[PDB]
Amino acid sequence: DGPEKNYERTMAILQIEAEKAELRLKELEVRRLMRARGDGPWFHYPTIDKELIDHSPKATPDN
């Protein structure tokens, strides 16, 4: 291989690896925020579903 091919092939390798490294660091930061704040799709622990609730008039009024 001529030096130009290896040189520019090296750049393509560096671009891919650099982009992956940045994404790896961002994911660690996103995961840290979602776990602490609970406002993301990750670490979304279930809560009781409100469609299970019966809203019809009851045998007694105070409820």
Cβ 16 to another protein, closest distance in Å? 6
CA separation for the pair 26, 38 (Å, rounded): 17
Contact 8, 18 (CB under 8 A): no
Can you tell me which residue has the tokens 């891919």?
Answer: 16
Scan residues 15-54 and list those touching another protein (CB under 8 A). Answer: 16, 19-20, 23-24, 39-41, 44
Cβ 27 to another protein, closest distance in Å? 8
Contacts to another protein by CB under 8 A: 16, 19-20, 23-24, 39-41, 44
